[PDB]
Every structure is written in C-alpha cells, then in structure tokens.
Structure 1
C-alpha cells in the first residue's frame, strides 16, 4: 500500500514486529481514529536501541515500561506538519510537548531533544486525520507538566 487509511497498515510494512508488540499490549486502539479524538500522530523511533528496549520489556514479566514508552510515542492529535506542533498537545502520557526549533520538514523538541521528521512515505487518505513522524534521535518526554 502507498496511501493509508490506518497507521497500522504503514507499520505493518515498516516494522511488523513493533505492530505485533502494540497488538500484544492491547494498544491498537491508541493508534486508531475515534469520533471524538482530534487525531492520531505516531512517532516511529528510527534508532534500534529504543525499539529493542520496547521489545525486551514487552516480552518480560513486567511489560509496564514498554507500555509507557509506547504511550509517549502516540499522540491523540493530528499533527501533520511543523506548523501544527504547537499548543496544548502531547502523547497518551499527559506530558505537554514543547518545540525547541523548527525547520521546513523537521521539529526538535525540548525535554529529550526528539528530532522529528514526517515519514516521507506516509500519505493518509483525504478524510483521515493521521500523521506519522520518524524520530531520528533523542527521546519523547516521559515526565513533565501535562497539557490540558
């Protein structure tokens, strides 16, 4: 597929292992559109270290930290471009995201220096309020003041 009505379809092509972890943690709903949900923005960790730690925790006898990391990577907002990375937005952790620097096709966040670039091959269908960014380096915030 080259156009996407669901983020899972893109993830099934880009990292089916991570999609299986998300399904195995009963988190597919976090990733999915819902009527009263502003949107979904998924932050895909480029660097294998973040993903390997998710996998190791996910398949352990306490997958609690894999769940919280995945919550920090999923925003119940539709944020397609650098312009929309403002205001009271954040992940399924309540933590508010703050922009440090913006470029034409890149955002850098405070509180972890997450370097985020839109996934070049993620194009939603025209209704769909879905976005995928690649986190090239840094970490998404785990703790901090909540957005409200």
Structure 2
C-alpha cells in the first residue's frame, strides 16, 4: 500500500480495483495518465455499481461517458484551480456553484468534491484526485475551449 503516487492507477488500485479494471477493459487507462490529470472518484457505491452494470452490459456506452465525465485532462489540486475553461473528457465545461477552502460544489449535477486526503502525488507530477461525496458530474452542457 503506497502513500505517494506516481500515477492515479496506483491510488485507484488501493481503493477500487474493480473500477480500475473497467477503465482498462474500456481502453481508457490513457485518459488517466499524464497537460495534467484530475480523477473524480465517486464515493457512493450506487454510482460505481451503475458504472459496473453498464460496463458489463451488451452496450457500455453509458459507462464510457460516465467515466469520461469523471476524468479531467487538467491539474486541479485545490479549489482555486476549479476555474476557467476546464472540464472532463466529455468536453463539458465545469461551472462552480460554491467554493471553499477544501471543498467545491459544481453546477449541472450538484457534485460535492473534496480533495482525497490520502492521495498525494510525486514531485512535479501534476496528478490530483477528488472524492465526489454526493451528486453527479455533468454529462451534457456548454463545452470548454480546450
């Protein structure tokens, strides 16, 4: 069990090996590899099992877009960086509803995001992991200029 992380997959392996297995079996591990990378871990098991349900269905389309909505190609370590033209691999721009010192609430789903207390990246490696305690990440909306 690692305490520092050179890649997000090592963190996800210690928390949810099943979800990491789905990311690999969907050919999406490259989206998790660092432009920075910020992963949104859905804490609620109902969300993750809905991902597993769709991923192991005859059409994993919804599991793909949902996992795309949880992976941002940007390095966002603190609430201060949750600003500007940023978003997930779906392309939908994220809009902040409320900001705090260690918490962020987004619009278009009301997703409450708190930085992972145990995730800490290697020196100068631009990786970040947030915990989605409630709500859902946006799926459709205005795009961010990439």
Fold similarity call, TM over 0.5: yes
RMSD: 0.4
1:104 is displaced (CA, Å) by 1.1
Q: Would you say how many aligned residue pairs link Structure 1 and Structure 2?
A: 143
1:21 is displaced (CA, Å) by 0.6
Q: Secondary structure at the match of 1:30?
A: helix
Q: Residues 86-140 of structure 1: CA distance to partner in whole angstroms, max 9, x if unpaired?
A: 0000000010000000111000001110000000000000120000000000000
Q: Structure 2, unaligned stretches of length 5 or more?
A: none
Where does structure 1 differ by over 4 angstroms across 4 or more consecutive aligned residues? none
Q: Residues 35-94 of structure 1: CA distance to partner in whole angstroms, max 9, x if unpaired?
A: xxx200000000011101100000011001000000000000000000000000000001
Q: Structure 1, unaligned stretches of length 5 or more?
A: 33-37
Q: How does 1:99-138 map to 2 (within 5 A)?
A: 99-138=96-135
- Give me the TM-score of the superposition, normalised by structure 2: 0.97
Q: Residues 18-42 of structure 1: CA distance to partner in whole angstroms, max 9, x if unpaired?
A: 000100111000000xxxxx20000
Tell me how far apart the structure 2 counterparts of residues 64 and 101 of structure 1 sit (CA, whole Å): 31
Tell me how far apart the structure 1 counterparts of residues 126 and 100 of structure 2 sit (CA, whole Å): 22
